[PDB]
Design a protein around this ligand. Structure first.
Ligand SMILES: CCCCCCCCCCCCC/C=C/[C@@H](O)[C@@H](CO[C@@H]1O[C@H](CO)[C@@H](O[C@@H]2O[C@H](CO)[C@H](O)[C@H](O[C@]3(C(=O)O)C[C@H](O)[C@@H](NC(C)=O)[C@H]([C@H](O)[C@@H](CO)O[C@]4(C(=O)O)C[C@H](O)[C@@H](NC(C)=O)[C@H]([C@@H](O)[C@@H](O)CO)O4)O3)[C@H]2O)[C@H](O)[C@H]1O)NC(=O)CCCCCCCCCCCCCCCCC
Ligand SMILES: CCCCCCC[C@H](C)CCC[C@H](C)CCC[C@H](C)CCC[C@H](C)CCC[C@H](C)CCCOP(=O)(O)O[C@@H]1O[C@H](CO)[C@@H](O)[C@H](O)[C@@H]1O
Ligand SMILES: *[C@@H]1O[C@H](CO)[C@@H](O)[C@H](O)[C@H]1NC(C)=O
Ligand SMILES: O=S(=O)([O-])CC[NH2+]C1CCCCC1
Ligand SMILES: [Cl-]
Lengths: 279, 95
């Protein structure tokens, strides 16, 4: 039931004079916004990506992000000019909010440096990560002391502005986020487990939402050796899943793949393994 | 972390039937990477990819996709070069 909205940023600093930034907005795993880094503007990926916010609100946010990117990818280089050979390095930022089932908002703002936790924002203060050392302490010192209401602005953004935006997005995107899309399925062979053995694969693709049930069956007996892949993304907001089973040659006959999904409304997909059984 | 590569079509493969080839590349770090979808060993220009994203452990992931038509003669693949790889990895699509 917990739903979340995150703005992510990836900064790659190659040397003292050269860096590249990338940024995007995500509603759970659904990308809803991009950033045009040259014009410095928000890209609204869906008709409903404005949420319920006004154009004045969204343009003020754009300007906030611009001022911020300025300050960040200036001060970072100014300081990393001294400690070169650290180059190339990469900074990741994940800022957002999570709404719990009772409605309680929870904000976060985590930073990573070269893929390790650098710091995070816990209450009203920037706390360095235990692992990383004096670097995290330096960054936290500059944020907690030199920088004015960027701490206060982050606070209001991730605790009040972000929940409001998330809910407005869910509402504005009502017909999209509540949609049901039916999968299709098909069988294939996978890589040979061994001589005298077969790998049966049942592909299920195009379903939404993500909960799905897929099993190899012998009539009504679920086959215990079934392995479920990870649920993988398709373009345009559906999902893909592989279910596989290794079987001895001569024991594949009679096996079927069975797929259940909310979109199917009790009409499961059943596919029987044929292989080279049919001349 | 090394990139993991998964290749999959959007619909059942049918020779002579338009379809989409997906390559999902994940769990890598740092973000610099070269992912190409290949037709007969040649890079496919008309490709789409998601904007870069990362998981809770900070490893990156991307989804590539391109329209394609499976053919008995044609070979399709996903090629990844990364700083953690000595040579480009290639994962070929079959079935
Ligand atoms: C919108 C609001 C946003 C707010 C947040 C924004 C920003 C937040 C964070 C910013 C930083 C905070 C953390 C800082 C922590 C500190 O702890 C800081 C300092 O670390 C220590 O510093 C020391 C500096 O001395 C290092 O020692 C040097 O190591 C080197 C190895 O590479 C060399 O061996 C060198 O020896 C020599 C040598 O051999 O070169 C000997 C010579 O004698 C000397 N020759 C002389 C004097 O002539 C020369 C000289 O000293 C150097 C070094 O000073 O200076 C110059 C020079 O004058 O030459 C200056 C000049 O400008 C520069 N040329 C140019 C064009 O710029 C030039 C050039 O040559 C090099 O560029 C290339 O060559 O170099 O140095 C050593 O000194 C030491 O290693 C290192 O640990 N640690 C860092 O990691 C730096 C920052 C890296 C982190 C970047 C990002 C992480 C944080 C991001 C998270 C963001 C937050 C998100 C939240 C924001 C929104 C809320
Ligand atoms: C590139 C990435 C873009 C990705 C596309 C997203 C697009 C889509 C549409 C997002 C929709 C909006 C949603 C709702 C985002 C809200 C919640 C997000 C999750 C949290 C925010 C995290 C970012 C890091 C914010 C950066 C600004 C920071 C906060 C410092 C700014 C300068 O401070 P300053 O001006 O000095 O703040 C100071 O405040 C003081 C007063 O207090 C003033 O006196 C000072 O002058 C000063 O202004
Ligand atoms: C800094 O990196 C950029 C991009 O790689 C490159 O064009 C430029 O020449 C580099 N600068 C130095 C001083 O090597
Ligand atoms: O994959 S899933 O089960 O669909 C996760 C919930 N859907 C979220 C992303 C799309 C917007 C609504 C919230
Ligand atoms: Cl989605």
């Amino acid at each position: 039931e917990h739903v979340s909205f995150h703005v992510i940023q990836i900064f790659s600093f190659v040397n003292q004079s050269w860096a590249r930034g990338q940024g995007s907005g995500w509603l759970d795993e659904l990308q809803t916004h991009g950033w045009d880094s040259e014009s410095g503007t928000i890209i609204f990926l869906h008709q409903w990506s404005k949420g319920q916010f006004s154009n004045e609100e969204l343009s003020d946010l754009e300007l906030l992000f611009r001022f911020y990117l300025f300050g960040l990818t200036r001060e970072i280089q100014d300081h990393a000019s001294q400690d070169y050979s650290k180059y190339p390095f990469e900074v990741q930022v994940k800022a957002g909010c999570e709404l719990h089932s009772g409605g309680s908002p929870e904000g976060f703002f985590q930073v990573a440096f070269n893929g390790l936790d650098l710091l995070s924002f816990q209450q009203t203060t920037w706390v360095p990560s235990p692992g990383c050392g004096s670097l995290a302490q330096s960054v936290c010192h500059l944020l907690n002391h030199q920088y004015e209401g960027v701490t206060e602005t982050v606070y209001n953004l991730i605790r009040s502005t972000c929940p409001r935006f998330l809910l407005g997005l869910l509402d504005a995107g009502k017909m999209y986020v509540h949609r049901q899309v039916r999968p299709e399925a098909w069988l294939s062979s996978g890589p040979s487990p061994g001589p005298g053995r077969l790998q049966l694969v049942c592909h299920v693709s195009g379903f939404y939402p993500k909960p799905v049930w897929v099993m190899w069956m012998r009539g009504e007996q679920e086959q215990q050796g079934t392995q479920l892949g990870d649920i993988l993304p398709n373009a345009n907001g559906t999902w893909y899943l592989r279910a596989t089973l290794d079987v001895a040659d001569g024991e594949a006959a009679g096996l079927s793949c069975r797929v259940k999904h909310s979109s199917l409304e009790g009409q499961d997909i059943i596919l029987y393994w044929r292989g080279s059984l049919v001349p | 972390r090394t990139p993991k590569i998964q290749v999959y079509s959007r619909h059942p493969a049918e020779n002579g039937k338009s379809n989409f080839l997906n390559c999902y590349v994940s769990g890598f770090h740092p973000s610099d990477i070269e992912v190409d979808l290949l037709k007969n060993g040649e890079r496919i220009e008309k490709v789409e990819h998601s904007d870069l994203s990362f998981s809770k452990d900070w490893s990156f992931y991307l989804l590539y996709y391109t329209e394609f038509t499976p053919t008995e003669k044609d070979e399709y693949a996903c090629r990844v070069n990364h700083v953690t790889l000595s040579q480009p990895k290639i994962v070929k699509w079959d079935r």
